[PDB]
Ligand binder design. Structure first.
Ligand SMILES: C[C@H](CCC(=O)NCCC[N+](C)(C)CCCS(=O)(=O)[O-])[C@H]1CC[C@H]2[C@@H]3[C@H](O)C[C@@H]4C[C@H](O)CC[C@]4(C)[C@H]3C[C@H](O)[C@]12C
Ligand SMILES: C[C@H](CCC(=O)NCCC[N+](C)(C)CCCS(=O)(=O)[O-])[C@H]1CC[C@H]2[C@@H]3[C@H](O)C[C@@H]4C[C@H](O)CC[C@]4(C)[C@H]3C[C@H](O)[C@]12C
Ligand SMILES: C[C@H](CCC(=O)NCCC[N+](C)(C)CCCS(=O)(=O)[O-])[C@H]1CC[C@H]2[C@@H]3[C@H](O)C[C@@H]4C[C@H](O)CC[C@]4(C)[C@H]3C[C@H](O)[C@]12C
Ligand SMILES: C[C@H](CCC(=O)NCCC[N+](C)(C)CCCS(=O)(=O)[O-])[C@H]1CC[C@H]2[C@@H]3[C@H](O)C[C@@H]4C[C@H](O)CC[C@]4(C)[C@H]3C[C@H](O)[C@]12C
Ligand SMILES: C[C@H](CCC(=O)NCCC[N+](C)(C)CCCS(=O)(=O)[O-])[C@H]1CC[C@H]2[C@@H]3[C@H](O)C[C@@H]4C[C@H](O)CC[C@]4(C)[C@H]3C[C@H](O)[C@]12C
Ligand SMILES: C[C@H]1O[C@@H](n2cnc3c(N)ncnc32)[C@H](O)[C@@H]1O
Ligand code: MET
Ligand code: SF4
Ligand SMILES: [Cl-]
Ligand SMILES: [Cl-]
Ligand SMILES: [Cl-]
Length: 347
């Protein structure tokens, strides 16, 4: 199919493997710009001009897993490990709510210390503030997920990483794609708004793999989808591999919006790390969420999944104001409510 024909099929919602493969394979500037415009327009029509702010607190960099891409992997001895106290986390969340955050995201390595009861206690305290709570804590027993839902958690982010089971197992040697999917299905069954997503440009990953990621996301109809480029970290086995391509990653975000028009899709910090102004571009190519860093010093600089974190030198309270300025200069509006998914049922 020609570029024009692929665009027409996307507009008619003929989302075949063949159409998706061709969209990711064509490198023509004209085609790409038309794809981005289509995603931007679909975003505006379905989810409007509000950009939802999710304040993220990265509360522990301790991890029991050994994912090959991740700077927090357990084999990395070149890292000072930290744990925020429950009181520090709650009060940091309170400060974010004081600054206008309507969702608090708690993210960590897979750190056994907190699990499950300390998390439950923290979630309960933050829910009293009248905001949404999102957890992003990795893979845990169903019972832990159940306890956290009962404690009042609203959403769970668990990127599927890669839908190729062979590549998944190689990159995530403690676990499997089967496990990851089972966790995502459990989260959905328990009533969480559930987020998946993937990295683009992983070593060994192919275009067909990216197509499979898109089809996987469409199959399971996730509420949120987080996508970013792979960025090699020097203290990992993938230190010498190539970074993911920004434009290809942007096309994945655009296609995700086209496939899942009413989903919540962040402009991830990795997009802003690989290219100056990358988040702002992504917000104009299908994304409608932004996640300003709210991890305080001295811990922020110790939570580097990949190097070059854009907020690392900024003050503790800088990032919420910074994204509000961003939203205004983009001609957009901040979210007025918790920014939960607003499903538009269609055919
Ligand atoms: C129209 C004016 C003069 C020229 C001067 C610098 C040019 C931009 C830069 O080249 C970067 C980038 C390259 C891409 O290829 C196409 C998009 C983009 C944003 C260009 C657009 C345009 O062409 C610009 C604004
Ligand atoms: C600002 C620059 C340069 C415009 C220019 O200056 N040329 C005029 C009279 S003059 O005499 O200057 O020729 C233009 C050139 C191509 C444009 C992007 C593409 O569309 C793809 C995409 C579409 C989305 O929807 C919105 C986001 C995005 C990334 C666009 C943003 C912006 O819009 C760009 C960079
Ligand atoms: C935290 C401190 C002290 C007072 C306090 O503890 N304030 C709680 C407010 C709680 N809310 C955010 C829910 C109010 C919503 C009111 S609103 O009318 O916006 O719906 C207050 C005093 C002045 C406030 C800033 C300025 O204003 C400018 C700006 C407005 C944006 O918008 C949000 C960001 C920002 C930077 C503000 C953040 C924060 O807030 C500040 C620092
Ligand atoms: C100027 C920087 C390179 C900076 C650097 O690292 N030097 C390069 C790297 C990625 C490039 C963008 C992407 O291609 C997506 C998109 C394609 C459209 O066609 C034109 C607009 C847009 C936003 C591109 C503009 C520009 O070209 C970018 C920012
Ligand atoms: C306090 C800092 C400086 C400035 C920079 C951008 C400003 C925001 C934008 O103007 C959009 C909107 C009006 C209200 C809101 C969110 C503003 C709050 C505040 O005024 C901001 C955060
Ligand atoms: C929180 C999310 O961050 C992503 N993540 C972890 N390590 C890297 C890296 N080196 N490069 C880019 N993204 C990464 C994973 O996709 C994880 O799910
Ligand atoms: C810090 S990585 C993101 C949170 C969790 N460890 C996961 O891998 O899903
Ligand atoms: S990606 Fe999440 S589980 Fe894997 S090593 Fe990093 S922090 Fe641990
Ligand atoms: Cl969220
Ligand atoms: Cl995300
Ligand atoms: Cl990211």
């Amino acid at each position: 199919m020609t570029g024009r024909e692929i665009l027409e099929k996307l507009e008619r919602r003929e989302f075949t493997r063949e159409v998706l493969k061709e969209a990711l394979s064509i490198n023509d500037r004209g085609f790409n710009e038309a794809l981005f415009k289509l995603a931007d327009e679909i975003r505006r029509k379905y989810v409007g001009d509000e950009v939802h702010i999710r304040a993220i607190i990265e509360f522990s960099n301790v991890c029991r897993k050994n994912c090959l891409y991740c700077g927090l992997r357990r084999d990395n001895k070149n890292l000072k490990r930290y744990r925020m106290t429950p009181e520090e986390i709650v009060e940091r969340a309170r400060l974010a709510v004081q600054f206008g955050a309507k969702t608090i995201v708690l993210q960590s390595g897979e750190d056994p210390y907190x699990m499950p009861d300390v998390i439950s206690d923290i979630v309960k305290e933050i829910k009293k503030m009248g905001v949404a709570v999102t957890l992003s804590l990795g893979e845990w027993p169903r019972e832990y997920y159940e306890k956290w839902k009962e404690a009042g958690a609203d959403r769970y982010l668990l990127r599927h990483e890669t839908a190729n089971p062979v590549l998944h197992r190689k990159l995530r040697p403690d676990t499997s794609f089967e496990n990851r999917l089972n966790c995502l299905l459990t989260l959905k069954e328990l009533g969480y708004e559930t987020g998946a997503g993937s990295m683009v440009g992983l070593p060994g990953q192919t275009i067909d793999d990216l197509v499979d990621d898109l089809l996987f996301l469409k199959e399971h109809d996730f509420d949120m989808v987080g996508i970013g480029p792979f960025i090699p970290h020097p203290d990992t086995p993938l230190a010498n591999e190539k970074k993911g391509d920004f434009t290809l990653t942007l096309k994945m975000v655009a296609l995700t919006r086209i496939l899942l028009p009413d989903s919540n899709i962040p402009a991830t910090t990795a997009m802003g790390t690989i290219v100056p102004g990358g988040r702002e571009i992504t917000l104009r190519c299908g994304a409608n969420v932004i996640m300003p860093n709210w991890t305080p010093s001295p811990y922020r600089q110790l939570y580097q999944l990949y190097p070059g974190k854009i907020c690392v030198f900024e003050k503790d309270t800088a990032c919420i104001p910074c994204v509000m300025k961003m939203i205004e200069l983009l001609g957009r509006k901040p979210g007025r409510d918790w920014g939960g998914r607003k499903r538009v049922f269609e055919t």
